[PDB]
């Protein structure tokens, strides 16, 4: 049996694979692949930053692709943002 | 509605708050609360580390509690391990 946390992580990992398996190195997500991922699996408050800005931000070693570890940065930033949005006033 | 990623992140945040709700500040999980979470929401490979070990490792600002941001360290670890497992063979 898998815990709730395991299921959530698996779904996150499933999302990455859906894009890394598109072309080229199947363990990497390229610029256009990421743009698709952002406008399809991410909320407005995250999308509106720009797919190119996000790519520049996620491609740490600047090899032209986003691998899993780098993708996890986006996942963490999204969690932090989601959490902050839940108890933020105006 | 919600995307697959939003759902996954909400589920992760909800699991943390399920235990942070027990006592004290809603934004804090105490050492005993963490032990309960680990034994219930985490797989054997995470638990075997020891509840006291996880608490000290996660309490980054040493305030005696584990906040959401700190909890993400555990989540990342699980993701990396889950990712590695999905690419494995029989
Ligand atoms: Ca690829
Ligand atoms: Ca890279
Ligand atoms: Ca609490
Ligand atoms: Ca702390």
Swiss-Prot record, chains A, B:
SMART domains: S_100 (SM01394). The keyword Cell membrane applies. CDD domains: calgranulins (cd05030). It holds the Pfam family S_100. It is found in: Secreted; Cytoplasm; Cytoplasm, Cytoskeleton; Cell membrane. PROSITE patterns: EF_HAND_1, EF_HAND_2, S100_CABP. Ca(2+) 1 binds at residue 33. InterPro entries: EF-hand-dom_pair (IPR011992), EF_Hand_1_Ca_BS (IPR018247), EF_hand_dom (IPR002048), S100/CaBP7/8-like_CS (IPR001751), S100_Ca-bd_sub (IPR013787). GO terms for molecular function: arachidonate binding; calcium ion binding; calcium-dependent protein binding; microtubule binding; RAGE receptor binding; Toll-like receptor 4 binding; zinc ion binding. It is a peripheral membrane protein. The keyword Transferase does not apply. Zn(2+) binds at residues 17, 27, 83, 87. Induction: (Microbial infection) Expression is highly induced in CD14(+) monocytes, neutrophils, and developing neutrophils of patients infected by SARS-COV-2. Calprotectin (S100A8/A9) activity on TLR4 signaling is inhibited by paquinimod. The modification S-nitrosocysteine is found at residue 42. Its main location: secreted. Calprotectin (S100A8/9) is predominantly expressed in myeloid cells. Except for inflammatory conditions, the expression is restricted to a specific stage of myeloid differentiation since both proteins are expressed in circulating neutrophils and monocytes but are absent in normal tissue macrophages and lymphocytes. Under chronic inflammatory conditions, such as psoriasis and malignant disorders, also expressed in the epidermis. Keywords: Antimicrobial, Apoptosis, Autophagy, Calcium, Cell membrane, Chemotaxis, Cytoplasm, Cytoskeleton, Immunity, Inflammatory response, Innate immunity, Membrane, Metal-binding, Repeat, S-nitrosylation, Secreted, Zinc. One of its GO terms (cellular component) is collagen-containing extracellular matrix. Residues 12-47, 46-81 form the EF-hand domain. Binds two calcium ions per molecule with an affinity similar to that of the S100 proteins. Homodimer. Preferentially exists as a heterodimer or heterotetramer with S100A9 known as calprotectin (S100A8/A9). S100A8 interacts with AGER, ATP2A2 and with the heterodimeric complex formed by TLR4 and LY96. Interacts with GAPDH. Calprotectin (S100A8/9) interacts with CEACAM3 and tubulin filaments in a calcium-dependent manner. Heterotetrameric calprotectin (S100A8/A9) interacts with ANXA6 and associates with tubulin filaments in activated monocytes. S100A8 and calprotectin (S100A8/9) interact with NCF2/P67PHOX, RAC1 and RAC2. Calprotectin (S100A8/9) interacts with CYBA and CYBB. S100A8 is a calcium- and zinc-binding protein which plays a prominent role in the regulation of inflammatory processes and immune response. It can induce neutrophil chemotaxis and adhesion. Predominantly found as calprotectin (S100A8/A9) which has a wide plethora of intra- and extracellular functions. The intracellular functions include: facilitating leukocyte arachidonic acid trafficking and metabolism, modulation of the tubulin-dependent cytoskeleton during migration of phagocytes and activation of the neutrophilic NADPH-oxidase. This is Protein S100-A8. It comes from Homo sapiens (Human).
